[model samples]
Each structure stands twice: as structure tokens, then as C-alpha cells.
Target: AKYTGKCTKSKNECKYKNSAGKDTFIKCPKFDNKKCTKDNNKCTVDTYNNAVDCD
Candidate 1:
């Protein structure tokens, strides 16, 4: 899912990731790659704030 809005923490930034764990500051998809190899079609999105739950 691509995030068109800004991050909660930093209202001036957006977060996204790729297959190689690369994150861009601009607006982009949350997970823009294939599923995990060891997790059976599951993709991981790493974040600094654990208080916010991503559904």
C-alpha cells in the first residue's frame, strides 16, 4: 500500500521500503516487493515507533 500522506512522527516525511530494505523519504508504497522467502507470502515493514500498530 502506498502512503500518500505524511508520517505521524514527522509530518514532513513519508516512508516506504523495497525488497532490498531500501527506504525513501518521499511518498511511496509501504511494501513494494515480493513476499518473504521464509515467511510464506508475508512482507515486513520496519518502523521506529512500535506504539503504532499497522493493520
Candidate 2:
């Protein structure tokens, strides 16, 4: 299952809020949510590898 989340880019790194509302860093290389303007940094989270990627 995936959890809907929000992302923020800082210092060229992508970070996001997980379902638990905890701040987490995305592991996908060069991933960014800046273009996800439709949802404004919208993202998705997965349990595996603490993965969080842009929508």
C-alpha cells in the first residue's frame, strides 16, 4: 500500500512527510516534486527501503 504525502526540496535533496507525519528523505536519485504543481509537491510513500517518490 502507498500513502499519500507531501514533499519539499532543499539543498538539492528531496524530503517528504510519511503517513506517520514523520519527515523522511527520499532515496530516489535526483527525484524532485517541483513539477508536481497540480498537487504542489505531492508524493507517495512505500514501506520498502523507506521509499518515497514524487507523484
The best candidate by TM-score is 2
CA error at residue 21 for candidate 2, angstroms:
7.7
* Candidate 2: residue 12 lDDT (0-100): 30
lDDT, candidates in the order shown? 0.31, 0.52
Clashes of 1: 0
For model 1, residues 5-49, the per-residue Cα lDDT tens digits are 224322323444533556644322333232122211222234443
| Candidate 2 per-residue lDDT over residues 3-51, each given as its tens digit | 5565544433345565577776654345454223333466666666555
Residue runs of model 2 more than 4 Å from their true location after superposition: 11-28, 32-40
lDDT, candidate 2, residue 31? 42
**Which pairs of residues have clashing backbones in candidate 1?**
none
* CA deviation > 4 Å runs, candidate 1: 1-11, 27-55
Candidate 1 TM-score versus the reference: 0.24
